[PDB]
Design a protein around this ligand. Structure first.
Ligand SMILES: *C(=O)[C@H](CCSC)NC=O
Ligand SMILES: [Mg+2]
Ligand SMILES: [Mg+2]
Ligand SMILES: [Mg+2]
Ligand SMILES: [Mg+2]
Ligand SMILES: [Mg+2]
Ligand SMILES: [Mg+2]
Ligand SMILES: [Mg+2]
Ligand SMILES: [Mg+2]
Ligand SMILES: [Mg+2]
Ligand SMILES: [Mg+2]
Ligand SMILES: [Mg+2]
Ligand SMILES: [Mg+2]
Ligand SMILES: [Mg+2]
Ligand SMILES: [Mg+2]
Ligand SMILES: [Mg+2]
Ligand SMILES: [Mg+2]
Ligand SMILES: [Mg+2]
Ligand SMILES: [Mg+2]
Ligand SMILES: [Mg+2]
Ligand SMILES: [Mg+2]
Ligand SMILES: [Mg+2]
Ligand SMILES: [Mg+2]
Ligand SMILES: [Mg+2]
Ligand SMILES: [Mg+2]
Ligand SMILES: [Mg+2]
Ligand SMILES: [Mg+2]
Ligand SMILES: [Mg+2]
Ligand SMILES: [Mg+2]
Ligand SMILES: [Mg+2]
Ligand SMILES: [Mg+2]
Ligand SMILES: [Mg+2]
Ligand SMILES: [Mg+2]
Ligand SMILES: [Mg+2]
Ligand SMILES: [Mg+2]
Ligand SMILES: [Mg+2]
Ligand SMILES: [Mg+2]
Ligand SMILES: [Mg+2]
Ligand SMILES: [Mg+2]
Ligand SMILES: [Mg+2]
Ligand SMILES: [Mg+2]
Ligand SMILES: [Mg+2]
Ligand SMILES: [Mg+2]
Ligand SMILES: [Mg+2]
Ligand SMILES: [Mg+2]
Ligand SMILES: [Mg+2]
Ligand SMILES: [Mg+2]
Ligand SMILES: [Mg+2]
Ligand SMILES: [Mg+2]
Ligand SMILES: [Mg+2]
Ligand SMILES: [Mg+2]
Ligand SMILES: [Mg+2]
Ligand SMILES: [Mg+2]
Ligand SMILES: [Mg+2]
Ligand SMILES: [Mg+2]
Ligand SMILES: [Mg+2]
Ligand SMILES: [Mg+2]
Ligand SMILES: [Mg+2]
Ligand SMILES: [Mg+2]
Ligand SMILES: [Mg+2]
Ligand SMILES: [Mg+2]
Ligand SMILES: [Mg+2]
Ligand SMILES: [Mg+2]
Ligand SMILES: [Mg+2]
Ligand SMILES: [Mg+2]
Ligand SMILES: [Mg+2]
Ligand SMILES: [Mg+2]
Ligand SMILES: [Mg+2]
Ligand SMILES: [Mg+2]
Ligand SMILES: [Mg+2]
Ligand SMILES: [Mg+2]
Ligand SMILES: [Mg+2]
Ligand SMILES: [Mg+2]
Ligand SMILES: [Mg+2]
Ligand SMILES: [Mg+2]
Ligand SMILES: [Mg+2]
Ligand SMILES: [Mg+2]
Ligand SMILES: [Mg+2]
Ligand SMILES: [Mg+2]
Ligand SMILES: [Mg+2]
Ligand SMILES: [Mg+2]
Ligand SMILES: [Mg+2]
Ligand SMILES: [Mg+2]
Ligand SMILES: [Mg+2]
Ligand SMILES: [Mg+2]
Ligand SMILES: [Mg+2]
Ligand SMILES: [Mg+2]
Ligand SMILES: [Mg+2]
Ligand SMILES: [Mg+2]
Ligand SMILES: [Mg+2]
Ligand SMILES: [Mg+2]
Ligand SMILES: [Mg+2]
Ligand SMILES: [Mg+2]
Ligand SMILES: [Mg+2]
Ligand SMILES: [Mg+2]
Ligand SMILES: [Mg+2]
Ligand SMILES: [Mg+2]
Ligand SMILES: [Mg+2]
Ligand SMILES: [Mg+2]
Ligand SMILES: [Mg+2]
Ligand SMILES: [Mg+2]
Ligand SMILES: [Mg+2]
Ligand SMILES: [Mg+2]
Ligand SMILES: [Mg+2]
Ligand SMILES: [Mg+2]
Ligand SMILES: [Mg+2]
Ligand SMILES: [Mg+2]
Ligand SMILES: [Mg+2]
Ligand SMILES: [Mg+2]
Ligand SMILES: [Mg+2]
Ligand SMILES: [Mg+2]
Ligand SMILES: [Mg+2]
Ligand SMILES: [Mg+2]
Ligand SMILES: [Mg+2]
Ligand SMILES: [Mg+2]
Ligand SMILES: [Mg+2]
Ligand SMILES: [Mg+2]
Ligand SMILES: [Mg+2]
Ligand SMILES: [Mg+2]
Ligand SMILES: [Mg+2]
Ligand SMILES: [Mg+2]
Ligand SMILES: [Mg+2]
Ligand SMILES: [Mg+2]
Ligand SMILES: [Mg+2]
Ligand SMILES: [Mg+2]
Ligand SMILES: [Mg+2]
Ligand SMILES: [Mg+2]
Ligand SMILES: [Mg+2]
Ligand SMILES: [Mg+2]
Ligand SMILES: [Mg+2]
Ligand SMILES: [Mg+2]
Ligand SMILES: [Mg+2]
Ligand SMILES: [Mg+2]
Ligand SMILES: [Mg+2]
Ligand SMILES: [Mg+2]
Ligand SMILES: [Mg+2]
Ligand SMILES: [Mg+2]
Ligand SMILES: [Mg+2]
Ligand SMILES: [Mg+2]
Ligand SMILES: [Mg+2]
Ligand SMILES: [Mg+2]
Ligand SMILES: [Mg+2]
Ligand SMILES: [Mg+2]
Ligand SMILES: [Mg+2]
Ligand SMILES: [Mg+2]
Ligand SMILES: [Mg+2]
Ligand SMILES: [Mg+2]
Ligand SMILES: [Mg+2]
Ligand SMILES: [Mg+2]
Ligand SMILES: [Mg+2]
Ligand SMILES: [Mg+2]
Ligand SMILES: [Mg+2]
Ligand SMILES: [Mg+2]
Ligand SMILES: [Mg+2]
Ligand SMILES: [Mg+2]
Ligand SMILES: [Mg+2]
Ligand SMILES: [Mg+2]
Ligand SMILES: [Mg+2]
Ligand SMILES: [Mg+2]
Ligand SMILES: [Mg+2]
Ligand SMILES: [Mg+2]
Ligand SMILES: [Mg+2]
Ligand SMILES: [Mg+2]
Ligand SMILES: [Mg+2]
Ligand SMILES: [Mg+2]
Ligand SMILES: [Mg+2]
Ligand SMILES: [Mg+2]
Ligand SMILES: [Mg+2]
Ligand SMILES: [Mg+2]
Ligand SMILES: [Mg+2]
Ligand SMILES: [Mg+2]
Ligand SMILES: [Mg+2]
Ligand SMILES: [Mg+2]
Ligand SMILES: [Mg+2]
Ligand SMILES: [Mg+2]
Ligand SMILES: [Mg+2]
Ligand SMILES: [Mg+2]
Ligand SMILES: [Mg+2]
Ligand SMILES: [Mg+2]
Ligand SMILES: [Mg+2]
Ligand SMILES: [Mg+2]
Ligand SMILES: [Mg+2]
Ligand SMILES: [Mg+2]
Ligand SMILES: [Mg+2]
Ligand SMILES: [Mg+2]
Ligand SMILES: [Mg+2]
Ligand SMILES: [Mg+2]
Ligand SMILES: [Mg+2]
Ligand SMILES: [Mg+2]
Ligand SMILES: [Mg+2]
Ligand SMILES: [Mg+2]
Ligand SMILES: [Mg+2]
Ligand SMILES: [Mg+2]
Lengths: 117, 150
RNA sequence: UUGACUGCGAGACAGACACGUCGAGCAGGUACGAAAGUAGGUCUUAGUGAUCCGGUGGUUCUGUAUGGAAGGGCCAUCGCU
RNA sequence: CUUGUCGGGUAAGUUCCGACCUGCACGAAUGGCGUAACGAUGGCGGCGCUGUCUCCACCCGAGACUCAGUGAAAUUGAAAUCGCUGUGAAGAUGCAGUGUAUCCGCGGCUAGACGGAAAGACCCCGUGAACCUUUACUGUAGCUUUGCACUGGACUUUGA
RNA sequence: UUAAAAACACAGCACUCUGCAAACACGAAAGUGGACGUAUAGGGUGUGACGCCUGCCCGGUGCCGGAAGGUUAAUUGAUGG
RNA sequence: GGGGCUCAAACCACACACCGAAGCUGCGGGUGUCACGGUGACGCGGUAGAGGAGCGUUCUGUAAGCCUGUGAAGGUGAGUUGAGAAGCUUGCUGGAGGUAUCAGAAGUGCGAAUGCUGACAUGAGUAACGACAAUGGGUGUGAAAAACACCCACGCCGAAAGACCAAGGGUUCCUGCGCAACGUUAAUCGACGCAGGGUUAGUCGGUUCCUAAGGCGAGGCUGAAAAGCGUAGUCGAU
RNA sequence: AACCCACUCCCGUUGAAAAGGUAGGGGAUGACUUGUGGAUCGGAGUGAAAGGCUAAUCAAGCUCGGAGAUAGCUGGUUCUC
RNA sequence: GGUCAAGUGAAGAAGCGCAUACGGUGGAUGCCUUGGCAGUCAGAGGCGAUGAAAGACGUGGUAGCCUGCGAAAAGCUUCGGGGAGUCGGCAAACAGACUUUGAUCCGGAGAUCUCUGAAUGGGGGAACCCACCUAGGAUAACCUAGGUAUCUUGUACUGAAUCCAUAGGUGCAAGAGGCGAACCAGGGGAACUGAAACAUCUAAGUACCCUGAGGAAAAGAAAUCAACCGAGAUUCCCUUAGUAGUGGCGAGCGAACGGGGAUUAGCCCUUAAGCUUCAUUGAUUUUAGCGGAACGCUCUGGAAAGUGCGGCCAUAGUGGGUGAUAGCCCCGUACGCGAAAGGAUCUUUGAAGUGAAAUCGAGUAGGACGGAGCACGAGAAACUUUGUCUGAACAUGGGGGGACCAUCCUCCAAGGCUAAAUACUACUGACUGACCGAUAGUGAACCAGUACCGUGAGGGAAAGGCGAAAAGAACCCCGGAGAGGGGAGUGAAAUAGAACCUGAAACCGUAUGCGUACAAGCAGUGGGAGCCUACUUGUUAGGUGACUGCGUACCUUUUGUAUAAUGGGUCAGCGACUUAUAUUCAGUGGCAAGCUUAACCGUAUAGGGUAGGCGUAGCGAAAGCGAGUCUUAAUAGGGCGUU
């Protein structure tokens, strides 16, 4: 029972060369170089699913800070006032109200200022 | 493998990988690394394990309504038409016929019949009993099975 | 005066193994002391060399048909900067 | 030791020539000391001659350069392939900080790519390999000693 | 096929072996060369035209000679157990 | 680390606030062990290495079955399903074979070994085109002339770069027809392809006659065997 | 001069050439050069001696066998959870 | 609508990137096979001086090569078969023919059979040169047929030193010589390696070289073993048993006794079984052939064997191929028949030869020195054999029983012949395969031991597929009376067009869409505008990715590599934990104080065969004793063992 590897080896090569679509140069057309690029891309994707939550939290904070100072208060003083009184709205929704619903954001900030903090 | 009894090039200086013969398993026309030789794939099965297997199979044939027991079964003259008619009255198509002694006239028939095989009590292997859909045994052959298998 | 004894030996210390170290007590015979008793070398820790092979003294073993012998086994012991 | 010391040659001589004797460590057929002739032999010094040089200049042919035709090679993980100062498998195009910089050829030069070539020859290791040596060990061809055989007779001296 | 030389050879010198079926060399051997030669010849060794010369040591290791004594192989087999 | 910083954006004390990990909490999933009968509780980084469970390829049985010219294997896209190796359904090409399920045997899975064999890249349309005796016109043929043939005129060898024997080669010699490949360019030309033709001896060279070195060697001598030497003899030119 | 050789420089080093070329150079009646045929060879031959030469291979040729020698040493070792 | 100033900034690509669609190169993958590999059952086990194995040259209507033949040359003559086409293949075409008055074709026998090769008349560089004698025939410068090597054996003649005869010299007859893959019996005989070095030892009496014989060879009928009971020639298989021994007592080497089987057989020197060679009596095989049953209709389709419906044959139903898948289309298969003539085997009986050594075994048994073999390496070392040297007795005698002696037992050496069971396969035939399917399988599927490399010995390749059928593209146009194309025609299909099935990847192009000329780095990943396309008309799908946060490949080897340490130019194909025998542990099964067979027999996976192995009892070095035993003076202690 002699086994020939022609059919199965090709099927395995084409799976890698399909994930390497759009890569520059030999990284998309030769198996040896494309194999390393497909593995490295997977390492970056796993790592960058954690940075995505870091990158967006930094962006929301940078926007609540800019919008709170329009109303006369820093970011760190706004969080203390919100926590002291009652408000438990996320930084994702606070950043959205800062941009779109500027009238509601002012009402929230005046609630944090009124808490003496 | 023929030839290849000398080095192709010297050990050092050429710039090529190290080789000692052209008939190497790595080379194109080289030999097989673990080449086969003729060998026997026969196992050992105890006498009482072989008999305990027949006792196990023969019981299921009764439980699955596949063992048909008739009082004797003989056919005169070797004719495949004749045996086909005799097998039709019982409504049997795929049948193994087991008897104490295979008749000369009964062996000549069923030799060309498609899905019919004629055997002997000491000839019926474990594979044959399971392969066929129905098993036809004479009352005499039933007695023989009771003194070779206890 | 010969306990620098013979057969052992509960139980331990050390330790990869092979080796190593201490030892109450029992039985045979002993030596000192009037006797309880002490004595299985020296205040203790160094002073040493596996196996094979060959030699010597014993022996309720074996001994190539049988009776013996040769040879072998068991105990004691000798020969390696 | 040492470029020993003295003399000659040169403006100046670790080399050369002649001497001294303190011969680390000359020496008489593994010959000692001289020697005419000879040497594509080693060292030193002169005359002539000169682009060897100060210091290079011009000119003549063959390449190099452009056009038409044919058409290799070593090398190569992949490249969107800068400088500096640090860090770092301790000498960075690729890391950190920073500074410069539009995209692409052609003719030239070789400072880096620890550039290409050859599984370092130097050094060490392997209870590795060859060949060589001897008063290493163990043998051996050859040479030689004696007993027996082929191989006998007689006489004589001496021994039991 | 990176060394042409002071390296090798050389004429000349010396020591030593060889009496002929020569020493010596190639051959399990027959045989062959030496040599169809015969010590003014043949082999080995060292030095190296020519001139003047070549000094002391025989303790070591070689070679040559000697035969008295001491040791000493196969072989033989008295005696003893 | 840079910009830049002096009642500091430096240092010393005290106070409150915030940022900040894959840590902890929240929500949704998957697994290992233990206990009770699906629930709870504690876990789930990993090299050498131990243990457990699986995917896929070729062949055999199930299978004289099932699928298939109303289109098999193979190739190439798309969509979709799992935790993974992987599975499934279809468009185009293809043109005759494939193997459900469960078992059984392996030449059973490749990116490396300066690995082996083919094909194809980079260097790159880059180096080089093989003595620096040297070429310039006219004509002709031709699809096409720097190179072919002829004519005029230049250069080079001439103790050869001329002529002839031996060895060696073996049709390369001549003619007619050709230019794919060979010719380091083109070719109408050729030592290239095809097809015909061409080598005439008493005196030339061999053979026949004779021998040298040397070879073989009837008998013979010697040697485990193969064989060695050698007499008569008979081969061997230069 | 021919012929044999190979002392110097430069070029060439992917060469016109796996050892050449152009300029000069040594011997050139002799221990000379050369053609043809023959003899000696692998622990063996031959060597005016360089461990040199024995078919571009020599501190022991090439070829086929023992043989897949041995390698405590480098290198490589292929699907998933 | 103006002039000026400030700000802002679309398009415009020499070239390039990504995606997609089409090509090119290239030859993988799939499917296939006229070629290999490995078995089982038979055959016959040699050919050659009557010229072998291996060749050179010639032979055809035309050039070459292969295959056959040999100046009588793809053939000549006779027999036997059949039953109509044929003049071999690459390899087709054009002519000449052959024939039912029996061709080509197949088998038996016969004739011819160039030159070289043991090569054999003498030489020689193989395929060449030069001869002699006899018989016959020509008359010129020859032709036809025979012979002429060497050695061994027998025979006839003759005759050296030397008188006789010995050596020798001639002529006759018969035999040998060379080749071949393995097997068999002898002669000579390594090393690497192992012992983790290496000498004894091992590897191993292996590899290799040489000599003879046969289809088999060899060995064979007790001067053998056993143990006081017995067996009964040799050979091969399973155990005994990796035991007793042997061994720098190291690495290692390794029996026998006794059991179970395959085969059956002995006979002579007061002359036999047997073996050859003829001559007969019969039978069987072999070298070629003959017959050999049963299917129609319909649908798709280029084509039916395939769909649907209904039958028939069977001692023939998983054979090959025919335009796709056939028991009934063809060739076959099961099953019956067949030999003018050759070969072989087994057979009865006549003969000749041999067996064959004459009369029971003397330089023999035994002994001393040096070796070899025995499992046994000098060891207490018995036994066989012999290079050197010696050396008996005669059945009241001799050999052996593992140093040696005594007693018992058992055989008769120094003379011969003998089948079967056993080993092998270069060679031929039949069947089969959980073997390969063109980088695999033979080095070789094809004009392969070829091309090519080497002075030689020697080494040694690459290279398969149109279609069912050549129907292989008439004719026109461009082009050099080209190459190559565009049409037209054949075909189911020419992107099946002869480099022809399918036709991937690397690599090279054309076309469209988006991005790209102020920008610094493993080329990605997270966020993300704009543009283009499709359509479900924007919480959508596909292509592109301006700008921006993080971000120094893979393998190996290491204490540690982005490392400027290794390896890789890329793609495709191949490429590394296997197999046999002995065992130990675990899982899972069959029997159970028992379990299980090996060789072998056999209907041959059954069944038989329980020789043997393990277990039910241990202790001791052993005799031995045994729920105990050993140590010891010891029923003390202690070691090991027992429910
Ligand atoms: C020593 O420095 C060595 C010289 C060796 S000569 C055999 N280095 C060489 O490069
Ligand atoms: Mg991209
Ligand atoms: Mg691509
Ligand atoms: Mg790859
Ligand atoms: Mg071969
Ligand atoms: Mg070889
Ligand atoms: Mg080999
Ligand atoms: Mg070899
Ligand atoms: Mg290299
Ligand atoms: Mg090898
Ligand atoms: Mg291979
Ligand atoms: Mg390969
Ligand atoms: Mg092969
Ligand atoms: Mg059985
Ligand atoms: Mg049947
Ligand atoms: Mg303790
Ligand atoms: Mg006491
Ligand atoms: Mg007292
Ligand atoms: Mg005895
Ligand atoms: Mg006895
Ligand atoms: Mg004794
Ligand atoms: Mg000095
Ligand atoms: Mg001075
Ligand atoms: Mg002066
Ligand atoms: Mg000077
Ligand atoms: Mg002197
Ligand atoms: Mg000297
Ligand atoms: Mg001196
Ligand atoms: Mg002198
Ligand atoms: Mg002297
Ligand atoms: Mg001198
Ligand atoms: Mg002098
Ligand atoms: Mg000179
Ligand atoms: Mg001088
Ligand atoms: Mg000067
Ligand atoms: Mg010039
Ligand atoms: Mg150009
Ligand atoms: Mg730049
Ligand atoms: Mg640093
Ligand atoms: Mg740095
Ligand atoms: Mg980087
Ligand atoms: Mg950086
Ligand atoms: Mg930086
Ligand atoms: Mg440039
Ligand atoms: Mg330069
Ligand atoms: Mg440079
Ligand atoms: Mg460098
Ligand atoms: Mg190497
Ligand atoms: Mg190295
Ligand atoms: Mg050295
Ligand atoms: Mg050592
Ligand atoms: Mg070591
Ligand atoms: Mg002697
Ligand atoms: Mg000279
Ligand atoms: Mg010299
Ligand atoms: Mg002399
Ligand atoms: Mg000298
Ligand atoms: Mg002296
Ligand atoms: Mg003296
Ligand atoms: Mg003397
Ligand atoms: Mg302050
Ligand atoms: Mg977090
Ligand atoms: Mg967590
Ligand atoms: Mg949870
Ligand atoms: Mg884990
Ligand atoms: Mg964790
Ligand atoms: Mg199957
Ligand atoms: Mg289709
Ligand atoms: Mg398949
Ligand atoms: Mg498909
Ligand atoms: Mg698909
Ligand atoms: Mg078809
Ligand atoms: Mg088919
Ligand atoms: Mg299956
Ligand atoms: Mg594999
Ligand atoms: Mg690959
Ligand atoms: Mg890997
Ligand atoms: Mg590779
Ligand atoms: Mg390489
Ligand atoms: Mg190019
Ligand atoms: Mg360039
Ligand atoms: Mg250039
Ligand atoms: Mg150029
Ligand atoms: Mg030129
Ligand atoms: Mg040139
Ligand atoms: Mg030229
Ligand atoms: Mg002209
Ligand atoms: Mg012209
Ligand atoms: Mg010209
Ligand atoms: Mg002139
Ligand atoms: Mg000629
Ligand atoms: Mg020609
Ligand atoms: Mg011509
Ligand atoms: Mg012409
Ligand atoms: Mg042209
Ligand atoms: Mg041309
Ligand atoms: Mg021509
Ligand atoms: Mg002559
Ligand atoms: Mg002569
Ligand atoms: Mg001779
Ligand atoms: Mg002779
Ligand atoms: Mg002559
Ligand atoms: Mg002659
Ligand atoms: Mg002549
Ligand atoms: Mg000449
Ligand atoms: Mg010379
Ligand atoms: Mg020189
Ligand atoms: Mg010059
Ligand atoms: Mg000259
Ligand atoms: Mg010159
Ligand atoms: Mg001179
Ligand atoms: Mg001169
Ligand atoms: Mg001469
Ligand atoms: Mg020779
Ligand atoms: Mg030499
Ligand atoms: Mg040479
Ligand atoms: Mg040698
Ligand atoms: Mg050697
Ligand atoms: Mg060679
Ligand atoms: Mg050679
Ligand atoms: Mg090897
Ligand atoms: Mg070996
Ligand atoms: Mg690795
Ligand atoms: Mg394509
Ligand atoms: Mg057979
Ligand atoms: Mg032929
Ligand atoms: Mg004739
Ligand atoms: Mg006829
Ligand atoms: Mg002849
Ligand atoms: Mg002859
Ligand atoms: Mg002749
Ligand atoms: Mg013969
Ligand atoms: Mg021998
Ligand atoms: Mg050895
Ligand atoms: Mg071993
Ligand atoms: Mg060893
Ligand atoms: Mg070793
Ligand atoms: Mg060693
Ligand atoms: Mg050995
Ligand atoms: Mg015969
Ligand atoms: Mg016989
Ligand atoms: Mg007898
Ligand atoms: Mg016997
Ligand atoms: Mg008896
Ligand atoms: Mg020892
Ligand atoms: Mg029929
Ligand atoms: Mg059919
Ligand atoms: Mg029909
Ligand atoms: Mg005879
Ligand atoms: Mg006699
Ligand atoms: Mg007798
Ligand atoms: Mg004897
Ligand atoms: Mg003796
Ligand atoms: Mg002996
Ligand atoms: Mg012995
Ligand atoms: Mg011993
Ligand atoms: Mg004797
Ligand atoms: Mg005897
Ligand atoms: Mg005896
Ligand atoms: Mg016999
Ligand atoms: Mg092949
Ligand atoms: Mg294929
Ligand atoms: Mg091949
Ligand atoms: Mg197509
Ligand atoms: Mg087609
Ligand atoms: Mg093609
Ligand atoms: Mg095609
Ligand atoms: Mg087809
Ligand atoms: Mg492609
Ligand atoms: Mg485009
Ligand atoms: Mg700027
Ligand atoms: Mg831009
Ligand atoms: Mg850049
Ligand atoms: Mg930057
Ligand atoms: Mg950069
Ligand atoms: Mg995104
Ligand atoms: Mg979109
Ligand atoms: Mg992005
Ligand atoms: Mg980015
Ligand atoms: Mg970054
Ligand atoms: Mg690596
Ligand atoms: Mg390292
Ligand atoms: Mg390190
Ligand atoms: Mg790092
Ligand atoms: Mg790297
Ligand atoms: Mg780098
Ligand atoms: Mg390095
Ligand atoms: Mg690296
Ligand atoms: Mg390395
Ligand atoms: Mg390294
Ligand atoms: Mg590399
Ligand atoms: Mg059990
Ligand atoms: Mg006890």
């Amino acid at each position: 029972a002699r086994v020939k590897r022609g059919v199965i080896a090709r099927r395995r090569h084409k799976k890698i060369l399909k994930l390497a679509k759009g890569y520059y140069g030999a990284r998309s057309r030769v198996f040896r170089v494309a194999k390393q690029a497909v593995i490295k891309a997977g390492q970056y994707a796993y790592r960058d699913r954690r940075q995505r939550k870091r990158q967006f939290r930094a962006l929301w904070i940078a926007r609540i800070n800019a919008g709170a100072r329009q109303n006369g208060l820093s970011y760190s003083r706004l969080i203390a006032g919100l926590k002291k009184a009652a408000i438990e709205i996320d930084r994702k929704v606070l950043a959205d109200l800062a941009v779109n619903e500027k009238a509601a954001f002012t009402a929230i900030v005046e609630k944090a200022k009124a808490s003496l903090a | 493998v023929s030839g290849g009894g000398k080095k192709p090039w010297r050990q050092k200086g050429t710039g090529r990988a190290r080789a000692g013969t052209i008939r190497s398993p790595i080379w194109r026309g080289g030999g097989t690394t673990f080449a086969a030789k003729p060998r026997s794939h026969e196992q050992k099965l105890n006498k009482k394990m072989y008999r305990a297997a027949l006792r196990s199979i023969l019981a299921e044939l009764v439980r699955l309504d596949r063992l048909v027991v008739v009082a004797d079964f003989a056919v005169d003259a070797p004719k495949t038409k004749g045996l086909v008619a005799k097998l039709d009255t019982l409504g049997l198509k795929d049948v193994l016929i087991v008897t104490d002694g295979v008749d000369e006239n009964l062996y000549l028939a069923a030799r060309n019949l498609a899905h019919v095989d004629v055997r002997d009590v000491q000839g019926s292997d474990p594979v044959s009993l399971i392969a066929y859909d129905k098993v036809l045994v004479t009352v005499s052959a039933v007695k023989k099975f009771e003194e070779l298998l206890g």
